[PDB]
Amino acid sequence: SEMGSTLTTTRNNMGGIFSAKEQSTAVQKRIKLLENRLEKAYVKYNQSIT
Amino acid sequence: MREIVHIQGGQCGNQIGAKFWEVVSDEHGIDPTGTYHGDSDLQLERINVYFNEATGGRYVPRAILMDLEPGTMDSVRSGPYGQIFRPDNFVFGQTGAGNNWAKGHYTEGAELIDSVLDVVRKEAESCDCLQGFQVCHSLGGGTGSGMGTLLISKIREEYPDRMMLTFSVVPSPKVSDTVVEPYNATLSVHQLVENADECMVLDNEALYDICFRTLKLTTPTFGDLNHLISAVMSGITCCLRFPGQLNADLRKLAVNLIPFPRLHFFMVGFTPLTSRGSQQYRALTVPELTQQMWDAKNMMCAADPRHGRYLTASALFRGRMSTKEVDEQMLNVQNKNSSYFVEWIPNNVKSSVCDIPPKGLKMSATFIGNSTAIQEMFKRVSEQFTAMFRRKAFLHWYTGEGMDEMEFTEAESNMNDLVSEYQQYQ
Amino acid sequence: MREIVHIQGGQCGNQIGAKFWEVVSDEHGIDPTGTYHGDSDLQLERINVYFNEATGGRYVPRAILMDLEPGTMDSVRSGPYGQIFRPDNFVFGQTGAGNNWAKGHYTEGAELIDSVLDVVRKEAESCDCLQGFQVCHSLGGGTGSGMGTLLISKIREEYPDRMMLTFSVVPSPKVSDTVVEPYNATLSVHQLVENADECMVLDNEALYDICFRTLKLTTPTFGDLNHLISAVMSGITCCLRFPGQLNADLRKLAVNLIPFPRLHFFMVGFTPLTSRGSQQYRALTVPELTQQMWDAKNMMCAADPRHGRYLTASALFRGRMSTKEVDEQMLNVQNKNSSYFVEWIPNNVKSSVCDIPPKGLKMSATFIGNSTAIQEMFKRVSEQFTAMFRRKAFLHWYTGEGMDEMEFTEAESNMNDLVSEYQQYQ
Amino acid sequence: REVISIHIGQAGIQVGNACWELYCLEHGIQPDGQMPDAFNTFFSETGAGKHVPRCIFLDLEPTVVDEVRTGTYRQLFHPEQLISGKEDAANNFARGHYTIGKEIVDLALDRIRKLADNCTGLQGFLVFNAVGGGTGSGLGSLLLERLSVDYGKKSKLGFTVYPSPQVSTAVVEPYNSVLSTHSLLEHTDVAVMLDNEAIYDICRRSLDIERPTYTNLNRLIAQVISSLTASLRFDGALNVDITEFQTNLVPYPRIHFMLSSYAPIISAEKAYHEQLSVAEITNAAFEPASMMVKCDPRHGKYMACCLMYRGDVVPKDVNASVATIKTKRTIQFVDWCPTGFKCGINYQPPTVVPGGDLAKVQRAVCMISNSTAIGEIFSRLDHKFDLMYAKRAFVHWYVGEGMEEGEFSEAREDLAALEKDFEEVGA
Amino acid sequence: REVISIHIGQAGIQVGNACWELYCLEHDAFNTFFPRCIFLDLEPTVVDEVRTGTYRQLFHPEQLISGKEDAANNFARGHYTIGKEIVDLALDRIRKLADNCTGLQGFLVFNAVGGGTGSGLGSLLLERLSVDYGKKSKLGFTVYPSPQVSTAVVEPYNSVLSTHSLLEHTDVAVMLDNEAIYDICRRSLDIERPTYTNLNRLIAQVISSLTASLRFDGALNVDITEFQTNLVPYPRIHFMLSSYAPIISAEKAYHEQLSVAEITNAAFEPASMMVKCDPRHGKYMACCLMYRGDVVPKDVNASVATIKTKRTIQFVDWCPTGFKCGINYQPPTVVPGGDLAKVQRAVCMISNSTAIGEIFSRLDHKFDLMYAKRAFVHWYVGEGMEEGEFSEAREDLAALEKDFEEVGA
Ligand SMILES: Nc1nc2c(ncn2[C@@H]2O[C@H](COP(=O)(O)OP(=O)(O)OP(=O)(O)O)[C@@H](O)[C@H]2O)c(=O)[nH]1
Ligand SMILES: Nc1nc2c(ncn2[C@@H]2O[C@H](COP(=O)(O)OP(=O)(O)OP(=O)(O)O)[C@@H](O)[C@H]2O)c(=O)[nH]1
Ligand SMILES: Nc1nc2c(ncn2[C@@H]2O[C@H](COP(=O)(O)OP(=O)(O)O)[C@@H](O)[C@H]2O)c(=O)[nH]1
Numbered sequence A: 001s002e003m004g005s006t007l008t009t010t011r012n013n014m015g016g017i018f019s020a021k022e023q024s025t026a027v028q029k030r031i032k033l034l035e036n037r038l039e040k041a042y043v044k045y046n047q048s049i050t
Numbered sequence B, C: 001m002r003e004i005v006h007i008q009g010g011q012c013g014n015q016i017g018a019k020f021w022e023v024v025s026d027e028h029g030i031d032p033t034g035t036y037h038g039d040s041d042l043q044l045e046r047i048n049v050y051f052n053e054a055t056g057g058r059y060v061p062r063a064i065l066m067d068l069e070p071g072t073m074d075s076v077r078s079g080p081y082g083q084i085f086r087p088d089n090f091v092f093g094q095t096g097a098g099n100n101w102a103k104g105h106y107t108e109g110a111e112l113i114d115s116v117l118d119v120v121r122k123e124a125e126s127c128d129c130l131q132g133f134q135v136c137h138s139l140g141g142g143t144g145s146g147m148g149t150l151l152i153s154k155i156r157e158e159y160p161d162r163m164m165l166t167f168s169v170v171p172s173p174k175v176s177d178t179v180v181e182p183y184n185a186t187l188s189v190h191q192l193v194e195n196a197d198e199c200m201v202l203d204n205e206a207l208y209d210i211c212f213r214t215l216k217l218t219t220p221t222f223g224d225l226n227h228l229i230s231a232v233m234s235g236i237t238c239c240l241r242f243p244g245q246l247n248a249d250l251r252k253l254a255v256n257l258i259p260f261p262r263l264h265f266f267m268v269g270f271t272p273l274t275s276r277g278s279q280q281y282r283a284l285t286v287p288e289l290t291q292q293m294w295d296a297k298n299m300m301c302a303a304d305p306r307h308g309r310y311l312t313a314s315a316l317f318r319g320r321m322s323t324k325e326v327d328e329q330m331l332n333v334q335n336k337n338s339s340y341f342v343e344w345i346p347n348n349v350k351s352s353v354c355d356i357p358p359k360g361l362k363m364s365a366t367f368i369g370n371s372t373a374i375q376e377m378f379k380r381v382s383e384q385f386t387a388m389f390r391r392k393a394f395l396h397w398y399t400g401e402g403m404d405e406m407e408f409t410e411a412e413s414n415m416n417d418l419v420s421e422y423q424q425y426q
Numbered sequence D: 001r002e003v004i005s006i007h008i009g010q011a012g013i014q015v016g017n018a019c020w021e022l023y024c025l026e027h028g029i030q031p032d033g034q035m036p037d038a039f040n041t042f043f044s045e046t047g048a049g050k051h052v053p054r055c056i057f058l059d060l061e062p063t064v065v066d067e068v069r070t071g072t073y074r075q076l077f078h079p080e081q082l083i084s085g086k087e088d089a090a091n092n093f094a095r096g097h098y099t100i101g102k103e104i105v106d107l108a109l110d111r112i113r114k115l116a117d118n119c120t121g122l123q124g125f126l127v128f129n130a131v132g133g134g135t136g137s138g139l140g141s142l143l144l145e146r147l148s149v150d151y152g153k154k155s156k157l158g159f160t161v162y163p164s165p166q167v168s169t170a171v172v173e174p175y176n177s178v179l180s181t182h183s184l185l186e187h188t189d190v191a192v193m194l195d196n197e198a199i200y201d202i203c204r205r206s207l208d209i210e211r212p213t214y215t216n217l218n219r220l221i222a223q224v225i226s227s228l229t230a231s232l233r234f235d236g237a238l239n240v241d242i243t244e245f246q247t248n249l250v251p252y253p254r255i256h257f258m259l260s261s262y263a264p265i266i267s268a269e270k271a272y273h274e275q276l277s278v279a280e281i282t283n284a285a286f287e288p289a290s291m292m293v294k295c296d297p298r299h300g301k302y303m304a305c306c307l308m309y310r311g312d313v314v315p316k317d318v319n320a321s322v323a324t325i326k327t328k329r330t331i332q333f334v335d336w337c338p339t340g341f342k343c344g345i346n347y348q349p350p351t352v353v354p355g356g357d358l359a360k361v362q363r364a365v366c367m368i369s370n371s372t373a374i375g376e377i378f379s380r381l382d383h384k385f386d387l388m389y390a391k392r393a394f395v396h397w398y399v400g401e402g403m404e405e406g407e408f409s410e411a412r413e414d415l416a417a418l419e420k421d422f423e424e425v426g427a
Numbered sequence E: 001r002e003v004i005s006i007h008i009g010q011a012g013i014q015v016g017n018a019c020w021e022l023y024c025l026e027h028d029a030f031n032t033f034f035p036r037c038i039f040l041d042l043e044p045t046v047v048d049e050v051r052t053g054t055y056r057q058l059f060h061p062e063q064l065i066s067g068k069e070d071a072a073n074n075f076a077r078g079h080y081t082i083g084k085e086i087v088d089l090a091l092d093r094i095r096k097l098a099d100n101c102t103g104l105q106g107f108l109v110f111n112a113v114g115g116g117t118g119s120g121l122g123s124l125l126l127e128r129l130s131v132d133y134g135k136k137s138k139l140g141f142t143v144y145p146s147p148q149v150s151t152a153v154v155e156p157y158n159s160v161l162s163t164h165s166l167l168e169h170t171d172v173a174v175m176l177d178n179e180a181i182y183d184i185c186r187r188s189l190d191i192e193r194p195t196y197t198n199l200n201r202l203i204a205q206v207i208s209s210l211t212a213s214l215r216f217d218g219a220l221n222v223d224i225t226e227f228q229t230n231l232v233p234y235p236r237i238h239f240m241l242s243s244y245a246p247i248i249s250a251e252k253a254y255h256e257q258l259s260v261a262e263i264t265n266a267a268f269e270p271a272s273m274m275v276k277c278d279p280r281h282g283k284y285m286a287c288c289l290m291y292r293g294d295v296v297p298k299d300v301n302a303s304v305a306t307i308k309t310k311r312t313i314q315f316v317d318w319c320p321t322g323f324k325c326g327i328n329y330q331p332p333t334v335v336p337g338g339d340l341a342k343v344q345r346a347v348c349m350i351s352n353s354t355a356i357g358e359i360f361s362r363l364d365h366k367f368d369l370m371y372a373k374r375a376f377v378h379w380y381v382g383e384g385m386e387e388g389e390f391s392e393a394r395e396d397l398a399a400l401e402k403d404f405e406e407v408g409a
C-alpha cells in the first residue's frame, strides 16, 4: 500500500508521459529562434556600418 | 469463463436436478449419448459454463449428486440423460439420516461432507473463473437440509468472494409430508440467513396450485413440478449463456435486489405457463407477459405479496423484444399500484432482455421479486416450532445426538428477530 | 544398439515376466509364433534391444527364466507367448527352496548359479553395446529373493560399469503370505543397498488397493496385477525403443533422481488408469495425467509420500504433446505444495517426452518419485524383525544352514542406519 | 489531423458498432477493409490497401465484445483493439473503480498510447459511456483521470448517456450517476448529454416507429457524430474544428454540459410530401420536441449555441435564420452574452445506410447548445439519490468493496455545490 | 565466402533440422552454405531420425556423426569419458570441410548447456578448434536454462561447468532461454500450447537474418568480423541479448501497419527479448540492428534517434554512438507449416548490456545450494572430475559478476 501511494504521487509529479519530450523540444526550438533573430540583427548593424 | 458448479442434495435435489440437466442439454443440442448434434454455431460458444468436453463430442455436466440412499442414485442413472453424468460425481453415503436434521448435520454429515467437498474442489479448480455455485435442496427432509446446509457453510468459508444460489422448497401446513418439518425448517433457515448470498423460496403448495389452474393438468406427478422449477433455473442463468441487448448476470441481479445483507429471500415466478387448451387462443406481446408475470396466483410460494410491500423486483426476458416496450411495462405496473411498492426507493424493478428463447415458445420471461411478505412463512413456521418446543415434543431424537437446548433457543431468536426486522423495513 | 538382457527369478519373477513379454511382443508386432507381423516401420528398427533374429524371421526374446520348481516353467511353456523363448534359456534347478532364504542363497543356489551365469554371459556378449540388465523378483520368497539377490551380486562383480534395474516387490503386514517375511526381506535389502543400481519398490497392498479404488475391478487375480507392473516396465524403457522430442535413457534417469549413492529406492505410478465404465467420460490432456500422477493414493507401494518429502521426482511422458505444458505442470506442483518438497534442491522434477504411445492409448505417463516416506516401511519391517529375533523364532531353519547371529545383527544394522539417513535428508 | 474514439461498457461499444458501420458505408469501404484521402482522420492505412479504424472497444464482460468479433466486421477491427475482461462490475461503481477497474485500465492505456503515436496532428479523444452502469461509470471515470494526467491539453469529447428521469432499468443508478459526475466534472473538457427517454420519444413521434429497440437509438447517435465530424473530414463553406467547441461554448471551466439535437429526423414518407430548406430546419433544431435530453430549455437561459449544417446550404440564409431566432422571445440568452451563436456549414450531405430507418434527406442541422435547464436535471437526480442515502440502502455493497461513508458525503456536497454554481451564473 | 555450422546434442541438431530446412527453402549466393554441416551426438536416436527422414539424400552419409551411447545429462561423462573417443573423429572431419573451403569466415556452433553432450563435448570441441585455428571466428548460439521453467535437475552443475569454457573459447555468444521464447510464442504468436518445433523455427529466423548480409547484396552489408568489433567492448564480455520483430501471426500481420519506426521500438521492449532478463535494470553497452528487405537508410537513421532521446532505457556513459546498423535487400522467407506471415521487412537486434549480469547471479544460488550439501557430486567425481573444478568454476562466475558491476559503473 505504501509503495502504491508513492507510485501515484510520483506519477502525478512527472506531469504526464509526453511532458519531457515537449519541454526538451521546445527549448531546442527556442535555441534556433534566437539564432535566427541574432543573424537578422547583425545584418542590420553591418548594413548600417557600410 | 463465467462458470457455475451445480450441487444437488437429497431426494428432492436429485429429481429437480435430473429434469434440469435434460432441459439445458436439449437447449444446447446435446443428445442423450452426450455428443453434439446441434446445428447453430451459437450453441457451442457458451457450453463452458455448464459442461466440459471429454472426447469426440462428449459433453459431461458440471454437477455433483449427493445423497444418503442409493434409490435416488439408481433412479437417476436409469432415466434418459442419465448416462451423461460422470459416475465419480455420485458422491454418496450409505446409512441414511431420515428426516432428522441432527442426523443430517452432526452424525452422517461429519463423514460424508469431506468427500463431497473434495469433489467440489476438483470441479471448482477444473474451471478458471467461478461465477458461483448452484445448490438445489429442500428444507423439510434431513439429508438435504442438514447436510446441504453444512455444505453451504463449509463452502462459504472456503470461497467467500463468489456468489451462491440455493433453490429451496420449504414446508407448509397444507403440504405436510413429515411431522418434524418445523424443527428442520427453523434450524435450516437460521444457517441460511448467515451463510447464503441469496436464496429463492419455493414451496410444493404453490406448485400444486399452478398445476391445477394455469397448467390445467390431469395428473401432475413430480415430473411436471420439477419441469417448472427447471425452467426457472434455466431462465435466470440464460444471460451468461446467450448474448442480448441488455445482459444481467447473477452478481448484477444480487446487488440490484438485495438492499440489506439479511434481506435475501426471494419469491419466483415464470411465464408463459399455459394449458394446452388455451395456448392456442393466446398472443405473444410484452403486456401479456407482464400481466401474467405480476399476477399473485402465479408466484411459486404461498406468500401473497400484496399482504406486504415490494422492496425490489426483477424480470429476465428472453426472445427478440423491443427494450422500449420492456421498460414502459415495468413503469406502468409500478405507477398504478404504487402502494404495493416501497416508497424510499424509486424504480424498484431491474429489467433485462436476452435474445434466445427456450425451445417450443417464441417469447418468455422470468420474475424475481424481493418482497417483505415472505415473513408470512417465517411466522407460519415458527408457531408450529413453538407449539412443539414449549412441550418438548420429538426433542430427544435431536438432543441425544449432540444438540442441546440453547441451539433451539438461539435458532428461535434469530428467526424471530428476522421476521421482526423484515417487519421494521416494511 | 543399446541392449537390455532380461532375467526373471522365482514364481513371482516368472509370472510377472510372462505378462511382460506378452505386452512387449504386441508392441513390436511379433506374433506368438515368433515372426514379425506389424504394420508401422517404427516397430522394426529397435527390436534388437529386446530380441535376437535367429533364422527365417524368428525373433526370440533375450530373456532368462530362473527358478527351482517346475510348476512355473510348465505353466509358462503352456500359455501363449510361451513358445517364443529358447528352451536352452530355461535354466532350472530341481529341488526347491520353499520360502527359506538360506536355501536360495547358500545351499541350492550353489549348484544353479553356475548355469545361469553361463547362459547370461553367452547371451550378454551376443549383443554389441550393452545398456544393462533387468531383473524381476520378490523379497518374501526364497528362490526369488535369495537366488536372485545372489545373482545380482555376481553380475555386479563381473560387469561393474553396466546399468541394473530391479523391479522388486516387498512384503507388508496387511498382505502377509509367509510367516518368515521379515527374516527374508531384511536380509534381501542388506544386499540390495550395495549391489543394485536402482530398485523400483512394489507391493501388493497398493496394487490390490489400486484395482479396488481406481480400476474398480471385481476379482483382481494375479494376471491384472502383473499386467499393471508390466505397463510400468514398458514405460521406463520406452525412450530407447522409440524416437521422441526429449530422450531419457536408464542412466539419464538414474543421475537425476539419486542425489546420494545409497538413496536408490523409488516409488512408481502409472497413468492413465480409469474404470471401463468411465473411460469415455474423460478427456486426455496433460493436466489430467498430472492430477492422477501426483495423487498419493496412486503409488504402487504402500507408503504414503505425503508422510515425508520428495527428494526428486521423474515423469516420462508418451504421446504427441507440447513440452511447455509439461514444464508448466511440473513447476505448478512444485510451487503450490512447497512443504512436501526438499528446500535445498530446486527443480525436483525431471521430465521427458516420447512420441510413441502404448498400444491402445493416446497419451500415458510414468512417475518415479524418490521420496523420504519410504523409510516408514523399513521401520515397519524392522519392528517385526526384532519381534522375532529378540526370541529366536524360526531362527534354526536358517542357522543350521550357515547364517550365524552376526548376519542378522548386520541386517538390522544396515536397516537402521538406512532409515536414519532418510530421516536425515528429510 | 486525427481523432480516436474509445468505447467503454455495453452501451459504449454498441454505439461504436453503429458508428463504424456508418463510417465505412460513407467512405465506400467494404466490411472486410479494402476499397473497391479524407478517411485519414479515422482510418490508418496498412499500405497493403487495408484500412483499420482508430478505436478501442473495452468492457468488463466478454459477451457484447465477442458477437462483434464474429459479425460482418470481423476483419475490419484489429484484434488487440477489442479489449475484453473476464467478469462484470455488475452495476456497482466502486467495483468498476477500485476492485476490477485497477486491473484493466492499465492495459487500455498502453494500447491507446500507440494509437496516439501512429497519429500526427491529434485533435483529441472522444469517449462513449453510459453512467448508469458500472463499467462505463467506474473505470470510465478512472480512465478519464489517467487521461487528464497524460495529455491534459487534448480535447476529450464525452458523449455520455445519463439515466432517464422516469424510464430506468437499474435501481442503484442514482448512486452511480452522482459519484461518476463528481469526477466527470473536472476531467471531461466538453461533455454532451444523451438521455434515453428523449431518443425514445423521437423514434416514436418523428420516425413514427412504435416498437424501437436499441439499434435505432445507436443509429441516430452515429448520425449526430457524423454530422459533427464532417467539418473535420470534409471541406465546407464555413468549417469548425473540435478545438472550437472548447472555447466558443463553455463560459466557465466547470459549466460544460451541452444539450444536443438533430434535424430533420424524418421517415421515408414525410420527406416525399415535405419540403427541406435552411430556415425550417433552423427552427426544428430548437423546439424541445427534438432534444436528446429530457429537459426544457424554455425553463433555462442560453449561454451560447452551436449549429452544424450539412448538405446544399448557402451561408446567407443560415445568418437570416439565426437572426429570426434571436428576434423571437420564446427563448432568451444570458445578459452577459450579447451574441450567443456559433454557426457552421459543410458541403457533404449525410449518407444513408441500408437497413436504417433514416431517409435520404437533402439537408440537415445538428445543434449543440449550452443552457441552464441542465441544472434542473442534476437537481432532479439529487432528490432521489439523497432519498435513499440517508437510510443507507445499498451502501453496504460499495463499502464492502473498499470504500467508506466519506466519499458519499463529499461527492454529494460537491455536486450540491455545482447546483449553487449554476444558479448564480444564471442570474 | 562460406561459413560452416556445427550442431551438437539433442537440442543442437533439432535446431539445425529446422535451420537447414530454411536454408534450402531460401535458395552463386548459395555458395556460402552449399551442406557444409556436421551433426554429432552420443545418442543415435535423433541423428538416425534424419537419416531416414525426408532429407535422406540431401546430407552426405558420413556427415551425420553418431556415437554409441549417451552422456546422460552428465557434463563429466560427455567431456572426459565418452567425448574422448568421438571428438577426434568429428574435428578430423571438420578440418577437411575447411580445406574444401577457401575464404572461411568462421564456424557457428549450436548447443544447449543444460545437457551433457551439448555442454561437455561442446566445450571439448571448442578447445581443439581454438588451438587449431585461433583466428577464425566461432559464433556460439547457446541455450541456457531458464530460471523458473526447467526440465532437468543437475543443469546448474552443467551450466556453470560449461560457461567456464564458453568465456575464453567462443567469440560472440548469444543467450537464448526457453521461457522467454515460450512467452514470445504465447504473447505475440498467441500460441498457447507450443512445442520444441515452433521454438526452433524462429531461432532459425535469427540465424538467417545475421548471415543474409554475406549471402545477398544490401545497401549496407555486414560480415561476421563486423560483429567482432562493434559489440564487444572487452575481450571477456561477449554475451548478447537477442530479439526479433515482427514476430506476428498470419492474420494480425495484414491488419497491422508494419514499418521501420515501430519495429525498431518493438525490438527494444523487454516483452520481445529471447532471454528471460529485464534490461531496465541494466545499461546498454552497444546495439546492433540487422534490417532485412524494404529498408531505406533514412527511417532506420530516424529510428535510432528516437531510441537515444527516450529515457525509459539508458546507455552506458561511454558510447554516444552506441549503435551498429545493417541493411539487406532480400526479404525474409517463409516455410509452409510455419506460423510467421510474410513481411516486407524485419529486424533482428543483437545488443550487449549489464542485464546479463543478473542471470549469472540468479544462477549462482541454485548451484551454490546444491553444491554446499554435495548433492549429485558423486556422479561427476566418479566420472573423472574432482572437487577442485567445481569450486574453481564457482569463483570464475563470481569474478564475472564483479566484472559486469565494474564495467557498468
Ligand atoms: N442509448 C442507449 N443506451 C443504452 C444502450 N444499451 C444500454 N444502454 C444504457 O446503459 C445503461 C446501463 O449500462 P450498460 O452499458 O448497459 O452496462 P455497463 O455500463 O457496461 O455496466 P455493467 O452492466 O456493469 O457492465 C442502461 O441504463 C441503458 O440505458 C443502447 O443501445 N443505447
Ligand atoms: N530450443 C530447444 N531446446 C531444446 C530442444 N531439445 C532440447 N532442448 C534443451 O536441451 C536441454 C537438455 O539437453 P538436450 O539437448 O535435450 O540433451 P543433450 O544436450 O544432447 O544431452 P544428453 O541428454 O546427455 O544427450 C533442455 O534443457 C532443453 O531446454 C529443442 O528442440 N529446442
Ligand atoms: N418439487 C418436488 N418436490 C419433491 C420431489 N420429491 C420430494 N419432494 C419434496 O421433498 C419433501 C420431503 O423431503 P425429502 O425428499 O425427504 O428430502 P431428503 O430426505 O432430505 O432428501 C416433500 O415436502 C416433497 O414436497 C419432487 O420430485 N419434486
Ligand SMILES: Nc1nc2c(ncn2[C@@H]2O[C@H](COP(=O)(O)OP(=O)(O)O)[C@@H](O)[C@H]2O)c(=O)[nH]1
Pocket (backbone or CB within 6 Å): C009, C010, C011, C012, C013, C015, C016, C098, C099, C138, C140, C141, C142, C143, C144, C145, C169, C171, C177, C178, C204, C222, C225, C226
Ligand atoms: N504380483 C504378483 N505377486 C506374486 C505372484 N506370485 C507370488 N507373488 C508374491 O510373492 C510372494 C511369495 O513369493 P514366492 O512366489 O514364494 O517367491 P519364490 O518362492 O522365491 O519364487 C507373495 O507375497 C506373493 O504376494 C504373481 O504372480 N504376481
Ligand SMILES: [Mg+2]
Pocket (backbone or CB within 6 Å): E009, E010, E011, E043, E115, E116, E117
Ligand atoms: Mg541429449
